[PDB]
Design an enzyme around this catalytic site. Structure first.
Site, PDB file in Angstrom:
ATOM      1  N   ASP A  74       1.868  -1.499  -4.591  1.00 10.22           N
ATOM      2  CA  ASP A  74       0.538  -0.938  -4.351  1.00 10.22           C
ATOM      3  C   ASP A  74      -0.371  -1.562  -5.393  1.00 10.22           C
ATOM      4  OD1 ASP A  74      -1.757   1.177  -4.312  1.00 10.22           O
ATOM      5  OD2 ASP A  74      -0.420   1.904  -2.781  1.00 10.22           O
TER       6      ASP A  74
ATOM      7  N   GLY B 239       0.821  -1.243   0.000  1.00  8.82           N
ATOM      8  CA  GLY B 239       0.000   0.000   0.000  1.00  8.82           C
ATOM      9  C   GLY B 239       0.831   1.259   0.000  1.00  8.82           C
TER      10      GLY B 239
ATOM     11  N   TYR C 138     -13.752   0.964  10.576  1.00  8.84           N
ATOM     12  CA  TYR C 138     -12.310   1.060  10.517  1.00  8.84           C
ATOM     13  C   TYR C 138     -11.646   0.774  11.847  1.00  8.84           C
ATOM     14  CZ  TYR C 138      -7.866   3.932  10.111  1.00  8.84           C
ATOM     15  OH  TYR C 138      -6.580   4.512  10.119  1.00  8.84           O
TER      16      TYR C 138
ATOM     17  N   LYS D 273      -9.118  -2.177  13.189  1.00 11.39           N
ATOM     18  CA  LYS D 273      -7.770  -1.891  13.711  1.00 11.39           C
ATOM     19  C   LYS D 273      -7.530  -2.471  15.130  1.00 11.39           C
ATOM     20  CE  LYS D 273      -5.677   0.351  10.315  1.00 11.39           C
ATOM     21  NZ  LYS D 273      -4.437  -0.228   9.677  1.00 11.39           N
TER      22      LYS D 273
ATOM     23  N   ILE E  13      -1.977  12.366  10.519  1.00 13.26           N
ATOM     24  CA  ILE E  13      -0.655  12.674   9.929  1.00 13.26           C
ATOM     25  C   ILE E  13      -0.819  13.749   8.877  1.00 13.26           C
ATOM     26  CG2 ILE E  13       1.383  11.827   8.728  1.00 13.26           C
ATOM     27  CD1 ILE E  13       0.757  10.697  11.550  1.00 13.26           C
TER      28      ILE E  13
ATOM     29  N   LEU F  47       1.806   3.685  -2.229  1.00 13.96           N
ATOM     30  CA  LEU F  47       1.604   4.925  -2.966  1.00 13.96           C
ATOM     31  C   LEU F  47       0.770   5.990  -2.315  1.00 13.96           C
ATOM     32  CD1 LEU F  47       1.440   3.345  -6.496  1.00 13.96           C
ATOM     33  CD2 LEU F  47       3.338   4.471  -5.364  1.00 13.96           C
ATOM     34  N   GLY F  48       0.242   5.665  -1.140  1.00 10.98           N
ATOM     35  CA  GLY F  48      -0.578   6.568  -0.356  1.00 10.98           C
ATOM     36  C   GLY F  48       0.175   7.683   0.366  1.00 10.98           C
ATOM     37  N   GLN F  49      -0.529   8.354   1.262  1.00  9.33           N
ATOM     38  CA  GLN F  49       0.033   9.452   2.064  1.00  9.33           C
ATOM     39  C   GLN F  49       1.278   9.083   2.896  1.00  9.33           C
ATOM     40  OE1 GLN F  49      -2.254  11.230   5.195  1.00  9.33           O
ATOM     41  NE2 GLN F  49      -0.673  12.798   5.409  1.00  9.33           N
TER      42      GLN F  49
HETATM   43  N1  LIG Z   1      -2.682   8.996   7.130  1.00  9.18           N
HETATM   44  C1  LIG Z   1      -3.048   9.088   8.419  1.00  9.18           C
HETATM   45  O1  LIG Z   1      -3.297  10.214   9.091  1.00  9.18           O
HETATM   46  C2  LIG Z   1      -3.134   7.792   9.223  1.00  9.18           C
HETATM   47  C3  LIG Z   1      -3.401   7.856  10.607  1.00  9.18           C
HETATM   48  C4  LIG Z   1      -3.490   6.675  11.344  1.00  9.18           C
HETATM   49  C5  LIG Z   1      -3.238   5.464  10.756  1.00  9.18           C
HETATM   50  N2  LIG Z   1      -2.933   5.388   9.395  1.00  9.18           N
HETATM   51  C6  LIG Z   1      -2.699   4.090   8.778  1.00  9.18           C
HETATM   52  O2  LIG Z   1      -1.586   4.141   7.780  1.00  9.18           O
HETATM   53  C7  LIG Z   1      -1.869   3.138   6.752  1.00  9.18           C
HETATM   54  C8  LIG Z   1      -1.787   3.848   5.417  1.00  9.18           C
HETATM   55  O3  LIG Z   1      -2.538   5.135   5.561  1.00  9.18           O
HETATM   56  P1  LIG Z   1      -2.401   6.191   4.296  1.00  9.18           P
HETATM   57  O4  LIG Z   1      -3.050   7.420   4.913  1.00  9.18           O
HETATM   58  O5  LIG Z   1      -1.145   6.253   3.513  1.00  9.18           O
HETATM   59  O6  LIG Z   1      -3.559   5.693   3.264  1.00  9.18           O
HETATM   60  P2  LIG Z   1      -3.887   6.086   1.835  1.00  9.18           P
HETATM   61  O7  LIG Z   1      -5.352   5.804   1.768  1.00  9.18           O
HETATM   62  O8  LIG Z   1      -3.329   7.404   1.427  1.00  9.18           O
HETATM   63  O9  LIG Z   1      -3.052   5.046   1.031  1.00  9.18           O
HETATM   64  C9  LIG Z   1      -3.360   3.687   1.124  1.00  9.18           C
HETATM   65  C10 LIG Z   1      -2.824   2.898  -0.114  1.00  9.18           C
HETATM   66  O10 LIG Z   1      -3.256   1.541   0.013  1.00  9.18           O
HETATM   67  C11 LIG Z   1      -3.530   1.125  -1.315  1.00  9.18           C
HETATM   68  N3  LIG Z   1      -4.357  -0.100  -1.336  1.00  9.18           N
HETATM   69  C12 LIG Z   1      -5.717  -0.091  -1.196  1.00  9.18           C
HETATM   70  N4  LIG Z   1      -6.088  -1.384  -1.349  1.00  9.18           N
HETATM   71  C13 LIG Z   1      -5.041  -2.171  -1.538  1.00  9.18           C
HETATM   72  C14 LIG Z   1      -4.868  -3.530  -1.788  1.00  9.18           C
HETATM   73  N5  LIG Z   1      -5.948  -4.336  -1.801  1.00  9.18           N
HETATM   74  N6  LIG Z   1      -3.604  -4.009  -1.990  1.00  9.18           N
HETATM   75  C15 LIG Z   1      -2.583  -3.213  -1.990  1.00  9.18           C
HETATM   76  N7  LIG Z   1      -2.709  -1.919  -1.845  1.00  9.18           N
HETATM   77  C16 LIG Z   1      -3.945  -1.348  -1.627  1.00  9.18           C
HETATM   78  C17 LIG Z   1      -4.216   2.315  -1.963  1.00  9.18           C
HETATM   79  O11 LIG Z   1      -4.083   2.178  -3.428  1.00  9.18           O
HETATM   80  C18 LIG Z   1      -3.338   3.503  -1.415  1.00  9.18           C
HETATM   81  O12 LIG Z   1      -2.112   3.774  -2.218  1.00  9.18           O
HETATM   82  C19 LIG Z   1      -3.219   2.600   6.998  1.00  9.18           C
HETATM   83  O13 LIG Z   1      -3.094   1.353   7.650  1.00  9.18           O
HETATM   84  C20 LIG Z   1      -3.869   3.682   7.867  1.00  9.18           C
HETATM   85  O14 LIG Z   1      -4.878   3.020   8.594  1.00  9.18           O
HETATM   86  C21 LIG Z   1      -2.949   6.600   8.602  1.00  9.18           C
END
Ligand SMILES: NC(=O)c1ccc[n+]([C@@H]2O[C@H](COP(=O)([O-])OP(=O)(O)OC[C@H]3O[C@@H](n4cnc5c(N)ncnc54)[C@H](O)[C@@H]3O)[C@@H](O)[C@H]2O)c1
Ligand SMILES: NC(=O)c1ccc[n+]([C@@H]2O[C@H](COP(=O)([O-])OP(=O)(O)OC[C@H]3O[C@@H](n4cnc5c(N)ncnc54)[C@H](O)[C@@H]3O)[C@@H](O)[C@H]2O)c1
Lengths: 320, 320
Positions: free
Chosen positions: B34, B8, B143, B147, B173, B10-12
């Site tokens: 991803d 995963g 969600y 978790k 974040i 490519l996300g944030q």
């Molecule tokens: N960003 C925050 O403020 C925050 C805060 C607390 C916890 N988290 C945790 O960090 C982790 C990532 O968060 P994020 O904000 O980067 O999320 P995001 O939604 O920006 O990115 C998530 C990525 O997961 C990918 N993904 C979705 N389904 C998938 C699959 N079936 N197989 C492979 N990849 C897949 C999506 O394409 C996306 O690139 C998560 O577990 C989230 O719960 C994030």
């Protein structure tokens, strides 16, 4: 009068619950199902409204609900504490996925839904003496993990969609009719069978490990009672209930008092002991008592007398 | 030196973690995967070591792990709070099933595995001031429910099989690298853009709702640090971490103090409102500080100054 669906109905709880529902609401009002068919000697063999349904088959589960239109459902299938540690993929599949289907069906078809939790949802940080309803939940078994997931998901359904989800954390349940399915509390039923057959009992739980327990007739009373309560009297979705606590050495004494006969018992610590040691010694169930009238009639000696009478009749073991 | 797999990615979080990991360990040491490909303007576009993998495909996930032989894995895919409430079947599929496969792979192939949890694992009985690491967990979103399951299952893998599972509960974040979506704390990234664009910010979170939050460079530091620790340094599997707490109106005063301009914020109702309100105001992260040296440099003004400088440089909005 409700129309009641029981899934996972052929096991320890479901066998006596199915009979009790049928007795109270009439056979036409109760449909029960299980992934297997009943054996000729099962108490539900030969009865109408006893169906074969794998709850992981989500289409077959919906068809059954849509046909019968229950207003209440007791959703019983799960892989339990000891067996789940040896079959964890099956536990994760059954305990997570059948639960999700059951809840979505409760939402879609307007059903009051009961899914039992367990003392195995607690672990070693719960506060093991007179454990409260709300505390730290750190289960040390995959079963326990999937039951905390059960409690929380069900509660989410209640909060988000108004699904009338109800649960209790059941203690070890003792009954005579259907043999147990692999919890750490199975030793207690087996001890009775060992005494009646005059065989050595090998107990995998250590002699002073106290656990919350309950005899089946009090359990059935509470399973029915919580379901009949008006939603307004309930302050929570998930209640602790207990009957009384005991250790293996305590149960052995109870049985030898009634039989006037020493049982041979070797404690040879198995998987069950490490699991049981992480669980409560006793539960506080004041909320259940206050909100909906959870009540217990049986003590350890009443239970053992009844057990020692029932098992020979039901299973043809020797008597006395 | 580790061989790190990020799923995963490519996300944030993944985008900036993948960059930091490649810098620290070398691009040949790091594999980013991803379910989508990077867009033309994505920071990871065109690089080697970027693979496409749907983590719901158990067999393909095992193939990738077999081929690359990671020693560390950051398992990041999940459906988060607001989208999970709108698409709960997707959340329960992704958040439960990919997690189970990840842990199984970490077991089978001896991988140190990080899976983040979140402040959304808490609900209104947690003790919302300086929330403790071990407390009542009653999440109000699917969600959050998933978790808690993640934390508990991961921990079971550690206890049962000796999987070196590590997690932190991440706060909201904040980073500049990615465009503010519709997530529950995503309002903060939106406000920064509105300030630069001199548009009005539409904020669904109550004006005085404090939440734990953290700026990305601190996040990156701790995400690496927790994985570098010898296992002997860790007294637990899941830790709270926080940066600092703020509300939307504090964020607005911070942005005003930096830009010496009035910025416009319209507070509305939206799904994020009720979700945020159920979460802690602040977290106690003293375990994480003491065990493995979690440390936070930024405070709100230092973050705002940086964000207001970075967003124009990376996205080409107006500066100063
Ligand atoms: N960003 C925050 O403020 C925050 C805060 C607390 C916890 N988290 C945790 O960090 C982790 C990532 O968060 P994020 O904000 O980067 O999320 P995001 O939604 O920006 O990115 C998530 C990525 O997961 C990918 N993904 C979705 N389904 C998938 C699959 N079936 N197989 C492979 N990849 C897949 C999506 O394409 C996306 O690139 C998560 O577990 C989230 O719960 C994030
Ligand atoms: N018996 C106890 O002391 C105890 C204590 C606490 C909680 N519980 C809970 O009560 C419930 C019933 O337990 P029990 O002791 O009667 O268990 P059991 O194992 O005796 O019975 C389980 C029944 O579920 C059926 N089943 C299994 N998989 C199925 C599937 N996929 N679809 C449909 N049916 C399926 C099995 O065939 C069996 O007849 C479970 O949720 C268990 O966690 C029991």
């Amino acid at each position: 009068m409700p129309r009641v669906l029981v899934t996972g109905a052929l096991g320890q709880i479901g066998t006596d619950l199915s009979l009790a529902l049928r007795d109270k609401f009439g056979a036409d009002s109760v449909l029960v199902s299980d992934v297997v068919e009943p054996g000729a000697k099962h108490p539900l063999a030969g009865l109408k409204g006893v169906e074969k349904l794998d709850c992981l088959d989500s289409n077959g589960f919906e068809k059954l609900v849509k046909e019968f239109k229950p207003t209440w459902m007791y959703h019983l299938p799960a892989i339990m504490s000891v067996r789940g540690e040896a079959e964890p993929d099956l536990a994760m599949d059954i305990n997570v996925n059948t639960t999700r289907y059951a809840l979505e069906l409760a939402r879609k078809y307007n059903i009051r839904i009961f899914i039992p939790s367990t003392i195995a949802a607690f672990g070693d940080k719960c506060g093991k003496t007179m454990t409260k309803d709300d505390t730290i939940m750190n289960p040390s078994t995959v079963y326990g993990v999937t039951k905390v997931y059960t409690e929380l998901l069900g509660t989410w359904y209640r909060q988000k969609y108004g699904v009338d989800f109800r649960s209790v954390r059941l203690p070890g349940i003792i009954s005579a009719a259907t043999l147990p399915g692999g919890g750490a509390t199975d030793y207690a039923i087996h001890m009775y069978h060992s005494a009646l057959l005059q065989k050595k009992c090998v107990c995998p739980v250590l002699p002073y490990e106290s656990l919350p327990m309950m005899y089946m007739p009090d359990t059935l009373n509470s399973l029915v009672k919580i379901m009949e309560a008006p939603l307004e009297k309930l302050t929570r979705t998930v209640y602790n209930i207990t009957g009384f606590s005991f250790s293996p050495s305590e149960l052995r004494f109870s049985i030898e008092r009634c039989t006037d006969r020493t049982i041979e018992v070797e404690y040879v610590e198995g998987p069950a002991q490490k699991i049981a040691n992480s669980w409560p010694d006793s539960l506080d169930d004041s909320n259940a008592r206050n909100d909906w009238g959870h009540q217990v009639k049986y003590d350890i000696d009443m239970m053992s007398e009844d057990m020692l009478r029932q098992i020979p009749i039901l299973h043809g073991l020797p008597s006395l």
